[PDB]
Amino acid sequence: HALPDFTSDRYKDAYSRINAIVIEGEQEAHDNYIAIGTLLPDHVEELKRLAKMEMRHKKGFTACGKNLGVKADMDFAREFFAPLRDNFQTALGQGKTPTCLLIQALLIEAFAISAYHTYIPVSDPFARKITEGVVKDEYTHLNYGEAWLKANLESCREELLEANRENLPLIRRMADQVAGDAAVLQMDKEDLIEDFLIAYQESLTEIGFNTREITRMAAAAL
Numbered sequence: 037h038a039l040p041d042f043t044s045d046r047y048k049d050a051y052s053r054i055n056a057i058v059i060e061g062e063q064e065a066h067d068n069y070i071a072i073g074t075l076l077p078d079h080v081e082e083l084k085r086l087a088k089m090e091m092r093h094k095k096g097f098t099a100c101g102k103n104l105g106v107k108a109d110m111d112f113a114r115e116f117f118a119p120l121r122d123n124f125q126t127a128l129g130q131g132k133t134p135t136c137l138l139i140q141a142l143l144i145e146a147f148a149i150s151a152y153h154t155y156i157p158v159s160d161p162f163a164r165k166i167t168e169g170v171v172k173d174e175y176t177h178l179n180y181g182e183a184w185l186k187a188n189l190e191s192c193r194e195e196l197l198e199a200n201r202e203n204l205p206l207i208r209r210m211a212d213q214v215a216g217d218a219a220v221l222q223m224d225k226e227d228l229i230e231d232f233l234i235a236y237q238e239s240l241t242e243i244g245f246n247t248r249e250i251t252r253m254a255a256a257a258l
């Protein structure tokens with residue numbers, strides 16, 4: 037806390053959707069951290085700094101698409117995120133800070149970390165430097181969210197178990213929907229799943245969940 041042919045129509049086609057998802061994910065991260073600031077007004081300056089970070093990342097990932105001569109399929113990306121975006125919006129409107137934090141700071145960050153770690157060894161030299169820069173910049177020891185959830189665990193255990201039950205399957209469906217395009221990019225779905233589960237288990241351990249609790253939570257993916 038072998039390399040694909042980056043110039044082929046097959047590669048560019050799959051990249052148009054993967055690149056769009058990463059770009060949209062970064063925009064949504066910016067919007068979510070600002071929204072979280074309305075729930076945690078004393079966290080506004082840290083959340084503004086984290087939102088500026090994600091926008092820097094959005095620009096770097098936009099340049100990855102441009103460098104390969106690929107037009108990002110933004111409509112596909114907006115639809116890909118719509119279920120999780122809807123649940124974040126519902127929790128936000130209800131003032132459900134633990135749900136908002138689990139979605140953004142835990143699920144989405146672990147999803148991003150796994151994607152970046154899996155992509156790095158199979159990426160083009162331009163995108164590799166951008167992605168490595170993004171991982172060597174997803175940072176505090178604990179996120180605004182480990183740290184707030186670690187500090188507030190006793191008041192929000194049941195909501196966290198509910199948020200996980202509702203949102204972890206959405207993350208699994210997202211991984212299923214993009215597995216084909218990820219394989220075109222020479223990424224193995226099993227590596228993505230393994231890295232996500234490890235990153236998510238690490239965050240849950242840090243927050244104060246025990247092994248049995250984590251096992252039951254990870255099982256909600258099915």
Ligand SMILES: CCOCCOCCOCCCCCCCCCCC=O
Nearest residue numbers: 058061062065148151208211228229232
């Ligand atoms: C239940 C296992 O779920 C496995 C999910 O594995 C991750 C597969 O994701 C590959 C698609 C790439 C999407 C990257 C998301 C970018 C979000 C960046 C937002 C920054 O906080």
Ligand SMILES: [Fe+3]
Nearest residue numbers: 062065090093
């Ligand atoms: Fe990011």
Ligand SMILES: [Fe+3]
Nearest residue numbers: 065090145174
């Ligand atoms: Fe992030």
